[PDB]
Design a protein around this ligand. Structure first.
Ligand SMILES: Nc1ncnc2c1ncn2[C@@H]1O[C@H](COP(=O)(O)OP(=O)(O)O)[C@@H](O)[C@H]1O
Lengths: 169, 23, 602, 457, 57, 140, 396
């Protein structure tokens, strides 16, 4: 009878383990689908960077956004070689907009001795003149920063809203 | 112990302030 | 000069702020883009240090710190009664109604007294344009509740000549109801006044306290009595009854209004008060009415921001001094003055001040003193005479259950009444768990002049009760090392009556309807019977131990076992079901039954 | 809306001391924001800004400071406080003390990013906990009844079966939607495996979440571990309206993590060196319990703590005893005599019990029967203490009845099998089967009406 | 042997239910992917440069 | 507690590569067909000349088999077969016996609790001693 | 490479040009190379608690940072060695110096180089083969009892680029090379592991099999499992030697580690005298137990940090043998002497006292130490269980 109780307990544990692994397979499938959405967004960005028109508008934003976070009097912008002609223009537009909004002068340089990896789809990274502080505006970083915070909206769209959730507490 | 530890810290802060005032 | 400075630094509830040149100590400020209330606890140059009254998680360096020139202050006026406020006087009811959320949102700027409600105002008739008026003058009565005539009065700092007075009618908290002129300067007053909480509201005189604060409980009212205007502590370990007593005074006492300060107390305390007080009723003029109409709650539950505990105490006493100036006999509960002292410990720790004991600041004694000294019976300010009072009841909660604790030690040196709760009684579910050895009241000489009038039989009975209990302890220390067989028969009677007093007089069940309240006429009648048994039983032994016909405690128990059971049964008499004449007649019958039974042994 | 601005990353670690990393040159430090540290070897760590002053930010590091380097460390300031990615899908899952998964599943897809601190539940909107839970244990459901949403800890000596009692509450708890959140701080793996195994074996997993901080996991995570559990419980109980039961294992190890942080920060000590603010910090955990206005859901809590050196006056059980509504006590003076569960009723009390009993909830006698069981058990201990001096020859016949009561009470009322479930009504029947040992007139806590209806039955 | 047979049956049932749930997840994804992908792409492209609110002068 | 993701997937590509090295040692000739079929899913990732980084990122992507509780059981069965066949090296056991012992081990609940493992450890204790022990009556 | 001493006060040395330092990194301070641990950083400066006596350290002396926190050199040459609590080899300090003392600032490597051990590479490996942390890349036949399984460090992984043929090697000969992310690691037989970091495992198993001591009361009424945690009241009259020697002469354990946490000088030397002379039967031979133990012995006057590190060294050795699939046992002859050493560290760090003067973290330092016991599935591929049983004596 003690052995039969152990057989029944083993059966219960085994059926519990089956239900646990089934639940986890579903949850892994959800995470893979959300990962596929973020990868498809990374691919869409890797298409946007081929249009120098939209991509110049992104770099004009991403460079000035960096300057507005650092606020130091000297800064270093880092990009790929492929980006550099666009980034030089972005810095040349950003310095005026920066001095206007901050009421102060800045010296900004592009990091021609230390370009970004060619694996990056696009965007910029910005540093102090002393390099001790940085801000990351790569398109991959921007997408992860937003796509992580938007994940409630993403889950609500790709799986429908949770019928049990009745208050935003 | 806690009182004496805070006293020793306050004395260290006074020394640091004096070293700055000597600039 | 800029009206705001900026956050320089933060450490828990303490924020340092730069560009604060010209900020006053204890000036109130708004910190952060969410405008969290805080109060300047220190000044250090063109820089200030602020005790923030709300949780600083997310405050940033360079956040604006708006100055105000106001100290920490309470709006006083119609709409206090029955409302529940946070530690900084914001009504939790309107916070809920506006936000539509179970949580208290950080930095909510809700007005303390509502301005959309119109209140019925009756001007005092005698006042007119050209009449003289001074601080504390009652210039109109607002019909706030059926129980509470809200005596509107001039703010204590104000004085002058009446320049306008509103006719009888309906008005809100922003409507001007009175206008003064003084030295050629006009001053417009609405039904709401703002008072700095740290400053005591003045009085014409602080009268001696000379009337009992009758409570729910037998042991309190009889053996360790509070006085209307008295300062009281209830030091007790966890789970002893310190809040059950605080609630029982609030539910059942002769106080005209209660201010209940949930300072650092558990959350469900406020829920239990808000559950019970609208359903529980007093009677006035033959009308039943809900006791919530005479109570105000200042919640600041244990999880709400640590600094707000200090503001909560000072809010509840400022409300209590306001209704004291109306002539109401106020009672103020403080559900833990040690949970307040712990907030002083925490801010003092963040400021890195030198501690006195257990980390508490050296000024803790003065902070507690300048709280309890706000109690009293008073000749109020202003024209019509009033005899209002604040009675304060601080439910001290000593760490580890040990009365050597600094808050308990400092509190005991300040209060005049001490209901020490013993955890060993509370474990046994002997409630109220008031230890009758350690407890005391300093007001007995002042109250004897009341008992000699209203209850002339009582002072001998009080004395004999304390003596019987003291003798039981002085006997128990012997019995515990030799056994009960060592005692004289008089001392068996002393021990047995001390068990009757322990189990049926001192013990009282605050939930069951028979003991939910216990009026003084029930209390004296119960005690008179238990001491009548003692004097007769003691006389029976002392009369007969001189002879072979000796009476003993066992002889008395076997002849009078039904009387012992009837004496213990006296607590079950219910003032809701049984009239005063019925309870008095039953208790007179037990006196006669005992007398005839003892006369049958002699 | 989302924080769109890109995060700054600082190499400006101007000092390291104990668990603290003191950044400098920081732009507008946000108090209590979370920083992600990257060590020289690329190891990720996390930390909270505990103080700010001008350009400086004192980051406490959760994973500890060993290997932090004043030149190669990179600190990414997230710009926001610590948030839990909560969702319904946290039921059926296991996470470590920092909220990362350890069941080999994916990260949680968040339905919301709740602040780990929560907010104070407004005392006007706090519904009073009136409804009873049967735990199935007579020593509870009889004399210490627990309300739906009532926070009440198990206090135990070290080595006692308190984990098995808390597992039994998870196994048997039901009303007279449901879910569990289990947390553990500094639990040995021999015990973590027990709880995880008991939930998996009882098939409970689809309605329980586990947060595990094991004995070797970084001690600072213990501070956030019960907050992650409660943050998940607030989502489940207020956003999803479940009845949640939260089990917090060794709040003693939580309080030890407070003592460590204060000793390292040199914060002001209260009793036994715990932080002077320990009551507030425990209140930030324990007050996140109870029903609320317009929500069907509720957070019950059963904290669990090993009382150090059995000392009821110790700051951990003392401050817990001043916050939580009632305490269930378990005792070596029962466990050594093999009395399972070892629940000593005498020091125990449920504050919310007075409301959770009588008509509609339980039989009308329950409130009286409980108080008389306390009187008889207590007088039994008192006459036992007398007997140990003067012997049974000095005791009266009634004192021998209180000793026989104590024996029958511990054997019948307390002792109960680990899978035995007793209703409250069966418990009160056993209550009277013991109270009937005394003559009717001895029962000085019970009303004459209650005796007349129930004493002869 | 009866427990082992029940485990094999249950294994088939939970796998069937898992493949059903995965089909439902794939459907909600394919019904919504384009809108979500375009929304993330809009937010990530819409930079909005901002100075921190505490900046002065 | 447990392992970092880099450690976990590293242990997976370890056990895949090791199952392949074991398979090449138990069966240099493709004689153990029914055994080899029960590892085809893992063996592809090592019979193809993949770089360690390629198989590692394939494990993170879930394309490689990657449950360590599955791989430990599957690897233990093969290793306890390889320890058997290596501990009897002077006598090559029959192919039907090899696939039979594999099936019996595959059917057993836990091989470390099995008397199979006890017997095999005793065989190794004798064998490993005899690989080193000097000439004497006991050792003969 | 090295900073410079800036200030000294008792054991605490402040150093400058320390900008590249790390918290709890280990440093050689002074021309004598005194050992010290970095207790604080304050920019380009570090504060080092020097373990050894600092008398004679001078401002401007060199301060060489070792790239590592306090760490144990694991490898062949452990068995039969005696170390102090910071892993210095006491037998080699004596034999190399011919002095009765431990010199201040010993540099002696903890596994002796210039000794050659017979190494056999694991015969299945090849150039281009995949390998993971905890894989056994060979065996060293150091003793008849104990074959040392040489294995890849837990954090290492990659593709093998070279393996040494069967032959004789010292601990610093390169035995294996492997590549990952285009970077090569050259591996010695010695492996260095941080002493306060738990060595990772594939699974922390439930403990289920008895550690037979060969003692009736113990093995019957109060069994300790393999991987179990246990205590003994180590006091004068109690006879604590009986369990210690019985475990040594008979136990169902493959390797035994002892830690002296600061024993009395004579009592420590009694233990160090006895164990070379103890023997057990193996394959019908009788052999000295020093073939299967290591002794982490400290007297009460060893540096405070050696006494506090003593248990962490003993458990890091025990976890290393556990990862070979040996059922390790270990004893600490008094954890109270270790807690006195921890109390003294805390008093020198000026931290707040908790109970009876001990630090706040005493409970978590004990619990995190005992939690390192257990039975485990080891790292790497050969599917080997191991264990550490911990017998920590207490002296109330
Ligand atoms: N007068 C009383 N009558 C009945 N029960 C009481 C009485 N006083 C206290 N109790 C019981 O003791 C419990 C603990 O008392 P309480 O005041 O709530 O605790 P604390 O002293 O920690 O505030 C109450 O919940 C109640 O069950």
């Amino acid at each position: 009878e003690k052995k039969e109780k152990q057989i029944e307990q083993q059966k219960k544990i085994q059926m519990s383990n089956l239900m646990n692994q089934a639940r986890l397979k579903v949850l892994r499938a959800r995470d893979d689908l959300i990962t596929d959405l973020l990868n498809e967004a990374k691919q869409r960005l890797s298409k946007v960077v081929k249009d120098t028109t939209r991509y110049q508008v992104l770099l004009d934003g991403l460079v000035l956004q960096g300057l507005y976070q650092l606020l130091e009097p000297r800064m270093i912008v880092r990009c790929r070689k492929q980006d550099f002609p666009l980034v030089k223009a972005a810095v040349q537009k950003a310095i005026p907009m920066y001095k206007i909004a901050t009421k102060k002068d800045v010296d900004v340089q592009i990091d021609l001795e230390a370009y970004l990896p060619e694996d990056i789809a696009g965007g910029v990274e910005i540093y102090n003149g002393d390099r001790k502080i940085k801000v990351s505006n790569t398109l991959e970083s921007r997408l992860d920063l937003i796509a992580q915070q938007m994940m409630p909206e993403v889950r609500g769209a790709l799986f429908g809203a949770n019928a049990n959730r009745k208050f935003l507490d | 112990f806690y009182r004496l530890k805070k006293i020793q810290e306050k004395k260290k802060i006074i020394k640091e302030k004096s070293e700055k005032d000597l600039e | 000069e800029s009206t705001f400075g900026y956050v320089h630094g933060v450490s828990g509830p303490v924020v340092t702020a730069c560009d604060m040149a010209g900020a006053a100590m204890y000036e109130l400020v708004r910190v952060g883009h969410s405008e969290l209330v805080g109060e300047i606890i220190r000044l250090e140059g063109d820089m200030a240090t602020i005790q923030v009254y709300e949780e600083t998680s997310g405050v940033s360096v360079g956040d604006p710190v708006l100055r105000t020139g106001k100290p920490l202050s309470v709006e006083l006026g119609p709409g206090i009664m029955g409302a529940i406020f946070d530690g900084i006087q914001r009504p939790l009811s309107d916070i809920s109604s506006q936000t539509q959320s179970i949580y208290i949102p950080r930095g909510v700027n809700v007005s303390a007294l509502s301005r959309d409600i119109k209140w019925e105002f009756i001007p005092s008739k005698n006042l007119r344009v050209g009449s003289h008026i001074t601080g504390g003058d009652i210039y109109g009565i607002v019909n706030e509740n059926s129980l509470i005539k809200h005596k509107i009065m001039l703010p204590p700092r104000s004085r002058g000549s009446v320049t306008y007075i509103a006719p009888p009618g309906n008005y809100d908290a922003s409507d001007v109801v009175l206008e003064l002129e003084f030295e050629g300067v006009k001053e417009k007053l609405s039904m709401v006044q703002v008072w700095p909480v740290r400053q005591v509201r003045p009085v014409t005189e602080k009268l001696p306290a000379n009337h009992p604060l009758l409570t729910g409980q037998r042991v309190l009212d009889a053996l360790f009595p509070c006085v209307q205007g008295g300062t009281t502590a209830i030091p007790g370990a966890f789970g002893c009854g310190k809040t059950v007593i605080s609630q029982s005074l609030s539910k059942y006492s002769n106080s005209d209004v209660i201010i209940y300060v949930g300072c650092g107390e558990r959350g469900n305390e406020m829920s239990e008060v808000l559950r019970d007080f609208p359903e529980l009723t007093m009677e006035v003029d033959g009308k039943v009415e809900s006791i919530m109409k005479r109570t105000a709650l200042v919640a600041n539950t244990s999880n709400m921001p640590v600094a707000a505990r200090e503001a909560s105490i000072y809010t509840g006493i400022t409300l209590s001094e306001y209704f004291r100036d109306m002539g109401y006999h106020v009672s103020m509960m403080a559900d833990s003055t040690s949970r307040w002292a712990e907030a002083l410990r925490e801010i003092s720790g963040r400021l890195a001040e030198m501690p006195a004991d257990s980390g508490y600041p050296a000024y803790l004694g003065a902070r507690l003193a300048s709280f309890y000294e706000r109690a009293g019976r008073v000749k109020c300010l202003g024209n019509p005479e009033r005899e209002g009072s604040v009675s304060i009841v601080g439910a001290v909660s000593p760490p580890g259950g040990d009365f050597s604790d600094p808050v308990t030690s400092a509190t005991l040196g300040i209060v005049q009444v001490f209901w020490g709760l013993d955890k060993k009684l509370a474990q046994r579910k002997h409630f109220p768990s008031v230890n009758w050895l350690i407890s005391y009241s300093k007001y007995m000489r002042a109250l004897d002049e009341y008992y000699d009038k209203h209850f002339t039989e009582f002072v001998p009975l009080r004395t004999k009760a304390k003596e019987i209990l003291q003798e039981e302890e002085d006997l128990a220390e012997i019995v515990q090392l030799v056994g009960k067989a060592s005692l004289a028969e008089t001392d068996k009677i002393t021990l047995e009556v001390a068990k009757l007093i322990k189990d049926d007089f001192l013990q009282q069940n605050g939930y069951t309807p028979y003991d939910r309240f216990c009026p003084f006429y029930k209390t004296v009648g119960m005690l008179s019977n238990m001491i009548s048994f003692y004097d007769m039983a003691r006389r029976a032994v002392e009369t007969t131990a001189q002879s072979d016909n000796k009476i003993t405690w066992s002889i008395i128990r076997e002849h009078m076992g039904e009387i012992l059971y009837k004496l213990s049964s006296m607590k079950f008499k219910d003032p809701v079901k049984d009239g005063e004449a019925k309870i008095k007649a039953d208790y007179a019958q037990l006196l006669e039954d005992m007398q005839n039974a003892f006369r049958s042994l002699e | 809306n989302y924080l769109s601005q890109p995060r700054l990353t600082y190499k400006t670690v101007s000092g390291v001391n104990g668990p603290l990393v003191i950044l400098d040159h920081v732009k507008f430090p946000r108090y209590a924001e979370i920083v992600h540290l990257t060590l020289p070897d690329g190891t990720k760590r996390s930390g909270q800004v505990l103080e700010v002053s001008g350009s400086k930010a004192v980051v406490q590091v959760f994973e500890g400071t060993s290997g932090i380097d004043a030149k190669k460390t990179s600190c990414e300031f997230t710009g926001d406080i610590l948030r839990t990615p909560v969702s319904e899908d946290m039921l059926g899952r296991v996470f470590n003390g920092s909220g990362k998964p350890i069941d080999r599943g994916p990260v949680v897809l968040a339905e919301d990013f709740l602040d780990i601190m929560g907010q104070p539940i407004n005392p006007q909107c706090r519904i009073y906990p009136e409804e009873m839970i049967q735990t199935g244990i007579s020593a509870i459901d009889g004399m210490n009844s627990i309300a739906r949403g009532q926070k009440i800890p198990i206090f135990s000596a070290a080595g006692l079966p308190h984990n098995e009692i808390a597992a039994q509450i998870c196994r048997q708890a039901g009303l007279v939607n449901f879910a569990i959140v289990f947390a553990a701080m500094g639990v040995n793996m021999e015990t973590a495996r027990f709880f995880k195994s008991d939930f998996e074996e009882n098939g409970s997993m689809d309605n329980v979440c586990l947060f595990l901080n094991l004995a070797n996991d970084p001690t600072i995570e213990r501070i956030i571990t019960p907050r992650l559990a409660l943050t998940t419980a607030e989502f489940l109980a207020y956003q999803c309206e479940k009845h949640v039961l939260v089990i917090l294992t060794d709040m003693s190890s939580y309080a030890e993590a407070l003592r460590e942080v204060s000793a390292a920060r040199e914060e002001v000590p209260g009793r036994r060196g715990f932080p002077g603010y320990m009551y507030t910090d425990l209140a930030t955990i324990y007050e996140r319990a109870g029903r609320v206005e317009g929500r069907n859901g509720s957070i019950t809590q059963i904290p669990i703590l090993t009382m150090p050196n059995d000392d009821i006056t110790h700051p951990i059980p003392d401050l817990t005893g001043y916050i939580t509504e009632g305490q269930i006590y378990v005792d070596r003076q029962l466990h050594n005599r093999q009395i399972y569960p070892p629940i000593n009723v005498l020091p125990s009390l449920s504050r919310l019990m007075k409301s959770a009993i009588g008509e509609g909830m339980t039989r009308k006698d329950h409130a009286d029967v409980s108080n008389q069981l306390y009187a008889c058990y207590a007088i039994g201990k008192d006459v036992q203490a007398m007997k140990a001096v003067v012997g049974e020859e000095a005791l009266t016949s009634d004192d021998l009845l209180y000793l026989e009561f104590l024996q029958k009470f511990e054997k019948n009322f307390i002792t109960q099998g680990p899978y035995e479930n007793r209703t409250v009504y069966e418990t009160l029947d056993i209550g009277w089967q013991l109270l009937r040992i005394f003559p009717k007139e001895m029962l000085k806590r019970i009303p004459q009406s209650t005796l007349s209806e129930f004493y002869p039955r | 042997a009866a427990a082992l047979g029940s485990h094999g049956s249950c294994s088939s049932e939970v796998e069937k239910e898992t493949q059903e749930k995965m089909t439902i997840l794939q459907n909600y994804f394919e019904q919504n992917r384009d809108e979500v992908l375009d929304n993330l792409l809009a937010f990530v492209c819409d930079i909005r440069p901002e100075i921190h609110e505490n900046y002065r002068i | 507690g447990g392992l970092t993701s880099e450690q976990y997937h590293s242990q997976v590509v370890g056990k895949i590569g090791y199952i392949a090295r074991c398979m090449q040692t138990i069966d240099p000739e493709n004689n153990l067909k029914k055994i080899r079929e029960d590892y085809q899913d893992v063996l592809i990732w090592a019979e193809k000349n993949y770089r360690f980084e390629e198989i590692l990122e394939a494990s993170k992507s879930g394309k490689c088999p990657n449950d360590l509780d599955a791989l430990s059981r599957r690897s233990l069965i093969l290793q306890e077969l390889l320890r058997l066949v290596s501990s009897i090296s002077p006598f090559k056991m029959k192919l039907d016996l090899i696939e039979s012992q594999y099936e019996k081990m595959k059917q057993h609940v836990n091989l470390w609790k099995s008397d199979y493992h006890v017997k095999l450890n005793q065989l190794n204790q004798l064998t490993d001693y005899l690989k080193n022990a000097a000439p004497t009556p006991k050792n003969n």
